[PDB]
């Protein structure tokens, strides 16, 4: 029972600290950025067998060459994507080009902490900051493939391999020794599914998990259920070796 | 009840305000500042406490001058002291636009007076915890005023507030008996430096700085400027002679 | 107006204005519905405590947003009128702006998207009602059944129920109904909804309202005598089996 | 509370046995007294003695008096205006 | 910015009522008691002037104001918000009627506008309900002479005769047997004097009692002649000497 | 629910807690003053108390001039006193340009009272901790004095007063009117009216004042002015000679 | 200047001298075919010691002269005795922004214990300047030759009246838009003195 | 601790302080550490960049305003972007309207006016990020230290961040050294490296951790990242 | 700060309801009792005033009843202050439909527009909801005779016989068993008289404490006639029905 601008004794806002804890309360989103492409994946976490695979979509498309995933509460994610596509597609009209991935992350993260009650100097109406974590990926003609993370605190870092949600601790440390600069696009697909299989309740299938891909030519592409099932069958052969 | 000291507009059972009283304690936690009023003009002086050797000498000006005829010195929170001059700067610009000739000293006191009064009437804002001393040479004679956090002010022959308020301002009473007929503007500069060192007994634990500025019709002729050159160093040796 | 925020993150990471709003749906009338291949059926109950309620003058529990799609909610009736009116205006606004008939997918994300605003808008409170949008897209016979939660999360379901005694009906729809082989006839879709209402309505007639959704903008509302016809056939095969 | 006319004779009571200089004015402390009482002037006469000890003065100068008179007005926090029972 | 309180100070109590309007009626009994009596030939209202200081002037203090020339008003207690309500009532009465319909509103329509201002204070935030209770009495061409009781909660009720204030318990009961169908204007004045005299524990004279009566249309109170249509206002304020004439009349 | 006493709302006793403390704020300064109605004019007196010698006696005043035809005296803290002072001057100017000729005394006391009633009813504004007392000479009712309470209730007085000793001062002005059975002083000259109110103030307070201890306002017909130090001291000369 | 609006014009002038300043104006108001009001007065008092005349459109000056009284009332009560430079600046800001809607001539003059009398005239543009003598209006168009030749610095009270009386007489006989009785005001250290003439007096000189 | 008196932004403590100002002040001391110094003809700004993972990058702690000036942030990162927009807006305001570059002395006063509005009014909050303003004009190089309250004071050099106050020991003994060094930008940059090294405990300065931005008369403001600062390690 | 004095008018309780709305429903039981009856040939409305005495004016007054339209009546049970706000906006919204579409407004459209006002304060505005309940009865050529009621929560449902105010469940018990579909206008009056007599707190029942406004249909079909019973006509039906 206080204002959203009240600082904690640690020097932080109460709205910022409790928003980071809502990330683990939702699903787990894992992705890896390589030199040949960025492999992103999410977990639908179906609570009932009657849930359709096309129901929950945690991977949207901001641009043909730029894509992102969501985790946790998806209520705040849909609002950010509307502003993310606004700061992107409209930016194409201004400069007649594609917006930078790092520049697009700044415009999206700046809309988090602008909330308040009766903000002086201008009109800002927001009840609470966004409690959703977004992993921003894309490709450009200069820096190359990059994978960022949009935090509710307004800060962003460039991660080569990042695991958010419930896998922000156990599944995050497993990607330290399994990542390498020479990792290709095909080997990265089996590496993500290898982590998603161990962190999932039941067996890994196309209904409980959805993966995407971002390349230079094809751009943002979502793996088909038949394409995903072929990668899962190849994963079982990699689990049993010696 | 409980919580009368929480918000602003809530009165105390004896008819006073706690937030106004709490703002007075914030005035005595800052650097002290004094003032001297004469017939030709007024003299401003402030003692700036130096924290460490990282401070650059004489590159910091605490006194914010309103137009050419009004200097302003404050003792208290630095952010709250600059907002009063910035508000008075717009009042002086709005006055000279419609009213032509610059605003006199007793007229400029009403702009800062009512503006602080509005902060005590709202629960969404807080009163200023800084005491600003302003003055100069008006169209007729001269005047000096000291704005208190409560908004109460009057004409002052001298004004001092800060850590040395109990000391420096107590020495102003001896200045009246010393020159009951009148005091020149040049002699008031040397007397202002001595008052700083008389109240320095509590400031001896840190490093100090002397900044003196005066305005009158005898020399500057309606120009408020800081003391520089050999005039500032001359007042230091005369003040430190009795110390 | 009122600029003070309401929804605040709990120290556990949740929101009080959300979870406490979900209890209003669980205390309301249960709304269950299923979808077949060629048809979609949305059942709804009423309050059995109040009597002397004329069915004709009483507004239907299933609100029709468009000719090809309707809305049957469960929850606070005070917050439902706000969603029904704003969804129908957007239905005509979409026909004005894009000159296209609305789709069930666009209607669900709009209503769920509007609910995301009030949760994020300081000075207002989230809706305490959950709506079920079911219909058919233009030039498409594929059934579309979408759930809209008060928190703003929407999803598609073959058979889903909300309201009181929801977990009892959900466990009944998983074993009895199969999503891989849905019924291709309208009569089997109506009898399936009645079987789910036997454990909630608990031997009642005038308190049951079933709405049949058919493609090509065809809506046939079952009357009081038509609903009891399917109830009798099921009760004869229930106790005897 | 003794007024300006009532306190005028009180300053000479507390300073009667206190040694001081030949030139003295008690009318200055009358205006300096804000809401004081008859006893608080004894405090003003007591603090004036210790101010002359550091300067090695057996007689209290009038300048040391005005410093001690305001010293009570500097402290404050005694309230004293909250008694409404005067009738 | 300005004010950050947009919420209403009046909330529903767990007992099923509003805590603000409940204590508002209590504050009406904390001050001077007014009254009024409606008759066939006019409406007679009366009140008492309680001077906080013995050197105060009762002529400058008017407890009976004038909204429209045909309708008077009287309050109870000190009436802190009474000046605010009357200033806002005279504006809405002339704007919505005199500036639109060209004529002054009747008694039934004016009390609805007076209560329209008080009912907004109990709902719209940033303000508190009015702790005053007025009495709307006047004459029109349809309802005739009518007296309405304005409650501090924002509701109005018609009454033949009523007395609200510190002595509202005893004074209202005494007016039940003293009122009947056939009464005159001067006959209703003696009814007000016998009831008010028992409620006055202080000095009893004409300067401490303001007696306002509504009679026929008086050409002397009009100010112009030659127009037979307007014969002057019905409401009239009795002077100090005319009130003392009826005090010894008992 | 201890916040019921911190704002203005209906109390379970049927009263207002914050309004009760508004009257208590006027006794913080402890300044006694009174006003009497003469024959053709009105003269108001006030006790001038200067705590420190550094204050300019000409700058410190408890009597403010709203317009040429209207004077004002206010009791209590100066910040709330000068807050309503500039608000009263704005209402006097708006009445001259828009409405008509110069504002009389009763209209100024009524508009300032209704302005405080809005601040009292609305919970986001605290009431003024001072008391507005206006003196002037009307061209119709003649001399009149209207004392505006901080609760927003204005009423006319014959001879009024202010301060914590008002109840003891009122007895002096009351007993004089009971024996003579007159509502105003019959002295036509305004000079005798000045010495009239000063005589009753000295005997009531038991203190002989000086030229700097009192400020006597004089409101004549369509004119208002404040007596200087020489004019106030001249009145005290004839008082000691007659009595 | 629209069609059908009342315009004062005529001739208004002020001449400073040693003991003070004396203004003057006529009583005639004429728009183009007809003399509307011959008994009126163009003198306006914004303050006891500060006087202001009115020229050009009548309502344009009467509205501005009243607004200045609203500003000087807040200026005098809150501060003190006004001066001639401050009062003339209020007329400038009102005519600067309203120059499109409000276009009229204004001449402001006052008395002081230091600078004595000063004359500040505002043309249709809205600027204000200091001049020892200033004329405005339609009647004053013909007096430019007489006022400049016979003007003297620091004259007496008798020479100041005779200078204005003979100047305004040429603005009447030679211009039909101006005429009537001559209304003049005298500003000295004693107070305000009113002086009025008649058509049977100055026309015989 | 937590909320007792000053938890409301408009409330004053009985000791004459403000906890909300103290809460945001402690955010800088727990943030990223940075140092700085200046000379007559040059000014050197050295900042340290951290992160939560080895695979993660390092967010830049130095924001560029114009070619003649720059700054650094220690505190919450997005709170400095809002203040940087107000500072860059005044740089283009004086460039378009006055055709002049924004002075360092006038930039501190305009930056103080932004923070004082949120502290004196309810509903706002003071920025808990520090700003070290560097730049050059016709007068010379100037360095400023921003606080959550908005205090602006010109200094030769200072440090804000984790264990930054303890790193001032090297700046005090060398205070008489770098102030007399003119025309030697390489030595002035290396002076800031030894100052920030006093606060290093766990990890030392590396290629990606070290961020140095120098500004001067003939040399405009330039941010050196990557291998550009590898030679100054 | 303004957060401490705010009582949080509209918030979701742990039980899933609203605090101010739950307490506003109790205020109806502390007000007069309004009982509507929908007959075959018309609609009969009943009401009882609270706090009445001899000094009350019985000539022209209606506390619990008003007329929003020629073909539509209304029954007011609740706080009178909060009632006039919705009643004034009712005639405005009713004439706007008649000003544009140039036809008589039905009851279903009139209630849902007024209910959205009560639903607005329960969502935004940070204010209290209206603590007054209404019963809307009118004639229409679409669904026929329509009888609806409202609540402080802003919900409306169809009702053949509705009872609000004091003793809500006590009156509805006698109305359920004695209701018939063939009940005419004359038989509907006897149903309200016997109900209000047994559910009151007094011994006898007079005509000063009751209010009745019905809707009668004349010989010409398609248009009804709104008739508010005067105190002279109220005491007449008490003798003919045997209530006295």
mmCIF file of N, CA, C and O in Angstrom, chain C residues 52, chain I residues 28 31-38 43-49 64-65 74-77 133-137 147-149 159-176 179 188-200 210-214:
data_model
loop_
_atom_site.group_PDB
_atom_site.id
_atom_site.type_symbol
_atom_site.label_atom_id
_atom_site.label_comp_id
_atom_site.label_asym_id
_atom_site.label_seq_id
_atom_site.Cartn_x
_atom_site.Cartn_y
_atom_site.Cartn_z
ATOM 1 N N UNK C 52 -39.826 -16.565 -10.837
ATOM 2 C CA UNK C 52 -40.712 -15.576 -11.457
ATOM 3 C C UNK C 52 -39.950 -14.674 -12.426
ATOM 4 O O UNK C 52 -40.119 -13.454 -12.432
ATOM 5 N N UNK I 28 -30.628 -0.655 0.681
ATOM 6 C CA UNK I 28 -31.963 -0.822 0.115
ATOM 7 C C UNK I 28 -32.932 -1.327 1.177
ATOM 8 O O UNK I 28 -34.094 -0.906 1.227
ATOM 9 N N UNK I 31 -34.536 1.363 3.351
ATOM 10 C CA UNK I 31 -35.378 2.330 2.664
ATOM 11 C C UNK I 31 -36.775 1.751 2.464
ATOM 12 O O UNK I 31 -37.090 0.647 2.917
ATOM 13 N N UNK I 32 -37.620 2.519 1.781
ATOM 14 C CA UNK I 32 -38.980 2.083 1.535
ATOM 15 C C UNK I 32 -39.041 0.835 0.675
ATOM 16 O O UNK I 32 -38.099 0.478 -0.035
ATOM 17 N N UNK I 33 -40.186 0.161 0.747
ATOM 18 C CA UNK I 33 -40.411 -1.087 0.032
ATOM 19 C C UNK I 33 -41.220 -0.807 -1.230
ATOM 20 O O UNK I 33 -42.354 -0.322 -1.150
ATOM 21 N N UNK I 34 -40.637 -1.114 -2.384
ATOM 22 C CA UNK I 34 -41.293 -0.955 -3.676
ATOM 23 C C UNK I 34 -41.505 -2.334 -4.286
ATOM 24 O O UNK I 34 -40.550 -3.105 -4.432
ATOM 25 N N UNK I 35 -42.751 -2.642 -4.638
ATOM 26 C CA UNK I 35 -43.120 -3.945 -5.180
ATOM 27 C C UNK I 35 -43.867 -3.716 -6.487
ATOM 28 O O UNK I 35 -44.968 -3.152 -6.486
ATOM 29 N N UNK I 36 -43.275 -4.150 -7.596
ATOM 30 C CA UNK I 36 -43.942 -4.091 -8.879
ATOM 31 C C UNK I 36 -44.695 -5.373 -9.192
ATOM 32 O O UNK I 36 -44.337 -6.455 -8.735
ATOM 33 N N UNK I 37 -45.751 -5.235 -9.991
ATOM 34 C CA UNK I 37 -46.567 -6.364 -10.425
ATOM 35 C C UNK I 37 -46.907 -6.169 -11.894
ATOM 36 O O UNK I 37 -47.415 -5.112 -12.284
ATOM 37 N N UNK I 38 -46.632 -7.185 -12.710
ATOM 38 C CA UNK I 38 -46.916 -7.155 -14.140
ATOM 39 C C UNK I 38 -48.130 -8.036 -14.408
ATOM 40 O O UNK I 38 -48.057 -9.261 -14.269
ATOM 41 N N UNK I 43 -49.546 -3.001 -15.875
ATOM 42 C CA UNK I 43 -48.518 -3.181 -14.857
ATOM 43 C C UNK I 43 -48.895 -2.344 -13.644
ATOM 44 O O UNK I 43 -49.167 -1.145 -13.773
ATOM 45 N N UNK I 44 -48.909 -2.972 -12.471
ATOM 46 C CA UNK I 44 -49.267 -2.316 -11.219
ATOM 47 C C UNK I 44 -48.009 -2.168 -10.376
ATOM 48 O O UNK I 44 -47.299 -3.150 -10.128
ATOM 49 N N UNK I 45 -47.735 -0.942 -9.937
ATOM 50 C CA UNK I 45 -46.580 -0.641 -9.106
ATOM 51 C C UNK I 45 -47.039 -0.237 -7.711
ATOM 52 O O UNK I 45 -48.046 0.459 -7.556
ATOM 53 N N UNK I 46 -46.294 -0.679 -6.701
ATOM 54 C CA UNK I 46 -46.602 -0.382 -5.312
ATOM 55 C C UNK I 46 -45.357 0.139 -4.612
ATOM 56 O O UNK I 46 -44.234 -0.259 -4.931
ATOM 57 N N UNK I 47 -45.567 1.039 -3.653
ATOM 58 C CA UNK I 47 -44.464 1.619 -2.903
ATOM 59 C C UNK I 47 -44.980 2.096 -1.554
ATOM 60 O O UNK I 47 -46.179 2.324 -1.372
ATOM 61 N N UNK I 48 -44.053 2.244 -0.610
ATOM 62 C CA UNK I 48 -44.373 2.704 0.734
ATOM 63 C C UNK I 48 -43.304 3.683 1.191
ATOM 64 O O UNK I 48 -42.113 3.366 1.149
ATOM 65 N N UNK I 49 -43.730 4.866 1.625
ATOM 66 C CA UNK I 49 -42.792 5.879 2.083
ATOM 67 C C UNK I 49 -42.320 5.579 3.501
ATOM 68 O O UNK I 49 -43.010 4.922 4.285
ATOM 69 N N UNK I 64 -41.337 7.946 -3.921
ATOM 70 C CA UNK I 64 -40.857 6.665 -4.418
ATOM 71 C C UNK I 64 -41.211 6.404 -5.876
ATOM 72 O O UNK I 64 -40.816 5.366 -6.417
ATOM 73 N N UNK I 65 -41.941 7.306 -6.526
ATOM 74 C CA UNK I 65 -42.390 7.099 -7.894
ATOM 75 C C UNK I 65 -42.141 8.354 -8.716
ATOM 76 O O UNK I 65 -42.218 9.474 -8.207
ATOM 77 N N UNK I 74 -41.579 4.466 -13.401
ATOM 78 C CA UNK I 74 -40.414 4.033 -12.639
ATOM 79 C C UNK I 74 -40.783 3.998 -11.162
ATOM 80 O O UNK I 74 -41.598 4.793 -10.687
ATOM 81 N N UNK I 75 -40.184 3.053 -10.440
ATOM 82 C CA UNK I 75 -40.359 2.919 -8.998
ATOM 83 C C UNK I 75 -39.003 3.090 -8.333
ATOM 84 O O UNK I 75 -38.058 2.356 -8.647
ATOM 85 N N UNK I 76 -38.906 4.051 -7.420
ATOM 86 C CA UNK I 76 -37.646 4.413 -6.783
ATOM 87 C C UNK I 76 -37.649 3.878 -5.359
ATOM 88 O O UNK I 76 -38.484 4.278 -4.538
ATOM 89 N N UNK I 77 -36.719 2.971 -5.062
ATOM 90 C CA UNK I 77 -36.507 2.471 -3.708
ATOM 91 C C UNK I 77 -35.024 2.595 -3.386
ATOM 92 O O UNK I 77 -34.196 1.905 -3.988
ATOM 93 N N UNK I 133 -31.943 1.874 -5.804
ATOM 94 C CA UNK I 133 -32.406 0.896 -6.776
ATOM 95 C C UNK I 133 -33.677 1.397 -7.449
ATOM 96 O O UNK I 133 -34.467 2.133 -6.851
ATOM 97 N N UNK I 134 -33.867 0.991 -8.701
ATOM 98 C CA UNK I 134 -35.004 1.428 -9.494
ATOM 99 C C UNK I 134 -35.736 0.220 -10.062
ATOM 100 O O UNK I 134 -35.162 -0.858 -10.236
ATOM 101 N N UNK I 135 -37.020 0.419 -10.347
ATOM 102 C CA UNK I 135 -37.858 -0.577 -11.006
ATOM 103 C C UNK I 135 -38.496 0.107 -12.205
ATOM 104 O O UNK I 135 -39.301 1.032 -12.040
ATOM 105 N N UNK I 136 -38.147 -0.342 -13.407
ATOM 106 C CA UNK I 136 -38.611 0.277 -14.639
ATOM 107 C C UNK I 136 -39.739 -0.549 -15.240
ATOM 108 O O UNK I 136 -39.580 -1.753 -15.473
ATOM 109 N N UNK I 137 -40.874 0.100 -15.490
ATOM 110 C CA UNK I 137 -42.040 -0.543 -16.079
ATOM 111 C C UNK I 137 -42.583 0.341 -17.190
ATOM 112 O O UNK I 137 -42.836 1.531 -16.972
ATOM 113 N N UNK I 147 -41.406 -5.360 -17.473
ATOM 114 C CA UNK I 147 -41.163 -4.991 -16.083
ATOM 115 C C UNK I 147 -39.737 -5.379 -15.724
ATOM 116 O O UNK I 147 -39.398 -6.567 -15.720
ATOM 117 N N UNK I 148 -38.908 -4.383 -15.423
ATOM 118 C CA UNK I 148 -37.514 -4.606 -15.074
ATOM 119 C C UNK I 148 -37.183 -3.881 -13.777
ATOM 120 O O UNK I 148 -37.912 -2.992 -13.330
ATOM 121 N N UNK I 149 -36.065 -4.280 -13.176
ATOM 122 C CA UNK I 149 -35.554 -3.644 -11.973
ATOM 123 C C UNK I 149 -34.044 -3.511 -12.091
ATOM 124 O O UNK I 149 -33.405 -4.174 -12.912
ATOM 125 N N UNK I 159 -38.461 -9.575 -14.689
ATOM 126 C CA UNK I 159 -39.203 -9.995 -13.509
ATOM 127 C C UNK I 159 -40.694 -9.842 -13.760
ATOM 128 O O UNK I 159 -41.142 -8.791 -14.228
ATOM 129 N N UNK I 160 -41.458 -10.890 -13.446
ATOM 130 C CA UNK I 160 -42.911 -10.780 -13.479
ATOM 131 C C UNK I 160 -43.434 -10.077 -12.233
ATOM 132 O O UNK I 160 -44.322 -9.223 -12.322
ATOM 133 N N UNK I 161 -42.897 -10.429 -11.066
ATOM 134 C CA UNK I 161 -43.204 -9.746 -9.814
ATOM 135 C C UNK I 161 -41.902 -9.530 -9.063
ATOM 136 O O UNK I 161 -41.214 -10.498 -8.727
ATOM 137 N N UNK I 162 -41.563 -8.270 -8.803
ATOM 138 C CA UNK I 162 -40.311 -7.908 -8.155
ATOM 139 C C UNK I 162 -40.620 -7.187 -6.850
ATOM 140 O O UNK I 162 -41.612 -6.458 -6.750
ATOM 141 N N UNK I 163 -39.778 -7.415 -5.843
ATOM 142 C CA UNK I 163 -39.918 -6.769 -4.543
ATOM 143 C C UNK I 163 -38.543 -6.325 -4.072
ATOM 144 O O UNK I 163 -37.618 -7.140 -3.998
ATOM 145 N N UNK I 164 -38.408 -5.036 -3.761
ATOM 146 C CA UNK I 164 -37.164 -4.467 -3.263
ATOM 147 C C UNK I 164 -37.469 -3.670 -2.001
ATOM 148 O O UNK I 164 -38.621 -3.368 -1.690
ATOM 149 N N UNK I 165 -36.412 -3.332 -1.274
ATOM 150 C CA UNK I 165 -36.555 -2.588 -0.039
ATOM 151 C C UNK I 165 -36.621 -3.487 1.180
ATOM 152 O O UNK I 165 -36.124 -4.618 1.196
ATOM 153 N N UNK I 166 -37.247 -2.956 2.229
ATOM 154 C CA UNK I 166 -37.365 -3.690 3.481
ATOM 155 C C UNK I 166 -38.196 -4.953 3.292
ATOM 156 O O UNK I 166 -39.216 -4.947 2.597
ATOM 157 N N UNK I 167 -37.747 -6.040 3.921
ATOM 158 C CA UNK I 167 -38.389 -7.351 3.824
ATOM 159 C C UNK I 167 -38.518 -7.790 2.365
ATOM 160 O O UNK I 167 -39.613 -7.941 1.821
ATOM 161 N N UNK I 168 -37.360 -7.992 1.733
ATOM 162 C CA UNK I 168 -37.342 -8.413 0.336
ATOM 163 C C UNK I 168 -37.798 -9.860 0.193
ATOM 164 O O UNK I 168 -38.704 -10.162 -0.594
ATOM 165 N N UNK I 169 -37.183 -10.771 0.950
ATOM 166 C CA UNK I 169 -37.551 -12.180 0.867
ATOM 167 C C UNK I 169 -38.897 -12.468 1.516
ATOM 168 O O UNK I 169 -39.519 -13.487 1.198
ATOM 169 N N UNK I 170 -39.360 -11.598 2.417
ATOM 170 C CA UNK I 170 -40.648 -11.823 3.063
ATOM 171 C C UNK I 170 -41.801 -11.536 2.111
ATOM 172 O O UNK I 170 -42.825 -12.230 2.139
ATOM 173 N N UNK I 171 -41.656 -10.518 1.260
ATOM 174 C CA UNK I 171 -42.721 -10.175 0.325
ATOM 175 C C UNK I 171 -42.746 -11.118 -0.872
ATOM 176 O O UNK I 171 -43.824 -11.468 -1.365
ATOM 177 N N UNK I 172 -41.572 -11.543 -1.349
ATOM 178 C CA UNK I 172 -41.510 -12.424 -2.510
ATOM 179 C C UNK I 172 -42.099 -13.800 -2.233
ATOM 180 O O UNK I 172 -42.454 -14.509 -3.180
ATOM 181 N N UNK I 173 -42.208 -14.195 -0.962
ATOM 182 C CA UNK I 173 -42.798 -15.491 -0.643
ATOM 183 C C UNK I 173 -44.290 -15.509 -0.953
ATOM 184 O O UNK I 173 -44.793 -16.466 -1.553
ATOM 185 N N UNK I 174 -45.012 -14.458 -0.558
ATOM 186 C CA UNK I 174 -46.442 -14.398 -0.836
ATOM 187 C C UNK I 174 -46.721 -14.108 -2.304
ATOM 188 O O UNK I 174 -47.778 -14.486 -2.821
ATOM 189 N N UNK I 175 -45.791 -13.441 -2.992
ATOM 190 C CA UNK I 175 -45.986 -13.106 -4.397
ATOM 191 C C UNK I 175 -45.775 -14.295 -5.323
ATOM 192 O O UNK I 175 -46.305 -14.293 -6.440
ATOM 193 N N UNK I 176 -45.018 -15.306 -4.893
ATOM 194 C CA UNK I 176 -44.728 -16.438 -5.766
ATOM 195 C C UNK I 176 -45.909 -17.396 -5.862
ATOM 196 O O UNK I 176 -46.234 -17.876 -6.954
ATOM 197 N N UNK I 179 -49.228 -15.655 -7.592
ATOM 198 C CA UNK I 179 -49.104 -15.107 -8.935
ATOM 199 C C UNK I 179 -49.743 -16.036 -9.957
ATOM 200 O O UNK I 179 -49.610 -17.261 -9.878
ATOM 201 N N UNK I 188 -54.546 -7.587 -9.810
ATOM 202 C CA UNK I 188 -53.166 -7.282 -9.449
ATOM 203 C C UNK I 188 -53.085 -6.249 -8.334
ATOM 204 O O UNK I 188 -52.085 -6.205 -7.608
ATOM 205 N N UNK I 189 -54.116 -5.415 -8.183
ATOM 206 C CA UNK I 189 -54.117 -4.422 -7.114
ATOM 207 C C UNK I 189 -54.303 -5.098 -5.761
ATOM 208 O O UNK I 189 -53.655 -4.730 -4.773
ATOM 209 N N UNK I 190 -55.181 -6.102 -5.696
ATOM 210 C CA UNK I 190 -55.406 -6.812 -4.441
ATOM 211 C C UNK I 190 -54.167 -7.576 -3.993
ATOM 212 O O UNK I 190 -53.991 -7.820 -2.794
ATOM 213 N N UNK I 191 -53.304 -7.961 -4.935
ATOM 214 C CA UNK I 191 -52.091 -8.688 -4.572
ATOM 215 C C UNK I 191 -51.093 -7.781 -3.864
ATOM 216 O O UNK I 191 -50.399 -8.216 -2.937
ATOM 217 N N UNK I 192 -51.008 -6.516 -4.282
ATOM 218 C CA UNK I 192 -50.079 -5.586 -3.655
ATOM 219 C C UNK I 192 -50.594 -5.069 -2.319
ATOM 220 O O UNK I 192 -49.794 -4.794 -1.417
ATOM 221 N N UNK I 193 -51.914 -4.932 -2.170
ATOM 222 C CA UNK I 193 -52.466 -4.418 -0.920
ATOM 223 C C UNK I 193 -52.298 -5.420 0.215
ATOM 224 O O UNK I 193 -51.964 -5.037 1.342
ATOM 225 N N UNK I 194 -52.524 -6.706 -0.061
ATOM 226 C CA UNK I 194 -52.377 -7.719 0.978
ATOM 227 C C UNK I 194 -50.915 -7.953 1.333
ATOM 228 O O UNK I 194 -50.610 -8.356 2.461
ATOM 229 N N UNK I 195 -50.001 -7.708 0.393
ATOM 230 C CA UNK I 195 -48.583 -7.927 0.656
ATOM 231 C C UNK I 195 -47.997 -6.812 1.515
ATOM 232 O O UNK I 195 -47.284 -7.077 2.488
ATOM 233 N N UNK I 196 -48.295 -5.556 1.173
ATOM 234 C CA UNK I 196 -47.745 -4.429 1.918
ATOM 235 C C UNK I 196 -48.324 -4.315 3.322
ATOM 236 O O UNK I 196 -47.707 -3.677 4.182
ATOM 237 N N UNK I 197 -49.488 -4.913 3.575
ATOM 238 C CA UNK I 197 -50.103 -4.808 4.893
ATOM 239 C C UNK I 197 -49.433 -5.730 5.905
ATOM 240 O O UNK I 197 -49.210 -5.335 7.054
ATOM 241 N N UNK I 198 -49.107 -6.958 5.500
ATOM 242 C CA UNK I 198 -48.509 -7.919 6.418
ATOM 243 C C UNK I 198 -47.010 -7.718 6.600
ATOM 244 O O UNK I 198 -46.456 -8.184 7.601
ATOM 245 N N UNK I 199 -46.344 -7.041 5.667
ATOM 246 C CA UNK I 199 -44.898 -6.877 5.708
ATOM 247 C C UNK I 199 -44.453 -5.570 6.352
ATOM 248 O O UNK I 199 -43.247 -5.325 6.448
ATOM 249 N N UNK I 200 -45.384 -4.727 6.795
ATOM 250 C CA UNK I 200 -45.013 -3.460 7.400
ATOM 251 C C UNK I 200 -44.762 -3.641 8.896
ATOM 252 O O UNK I 200 -44.946 -4.723 9.461
ATOM 253 N N UNK I 210 -48.774 5.027 1.388
ATOM 254 C CA UNK I 210 -48.652 4.191 0.205
ATOM 255 C C UNK I 210 -48.674 5.044 -1.056
ATOM 256 O O UNK I 210 -49.210 6.156 -1.075
ATOM 257 N N UNK I 211 -48.078 4.503 -2.117
ATOM 258 C CA UNK I 211 -48.062 5.139 -3.429
ATOM 259 C C UNK I 211 -48.300 4.078 -4.489
ATOM 260 O O UNK I 211 -47.672 3.015 -4.457
ATOM 261 N N UNK I 212 -49.204 4.364 -5.425
ATOM 262 C CA UNK I 212 -49.546 3.423 -6.486
ATOM 263 C C UNK I 212 -49.631 4.170 -7.806
ATOM 264 O O UNK I 212 -50.388 5.138 -7.926
ATOM 265 N N UNK I 213 -48.855 3.723 -8.791
ATOM 266 C CA UNK I 213 -48.931 4.238 -10.156
ATOM 267 C C UNK I 213 -48.971 3.046 -11.102
ATOM 268 O O UNK I 213 -48.001 2.286 -11.188
ATOM 269 N N UNK I 214 -50.084 2.882 -11.808
ATOM 270 C CA UNK I 214 -50.286 1.762 -12.712
ATOM 271 C C UNK I 214 -50.184 2.228 -14.161
ATOM 272 O O UNK I 214 -49.966 3.409 -14.452
#
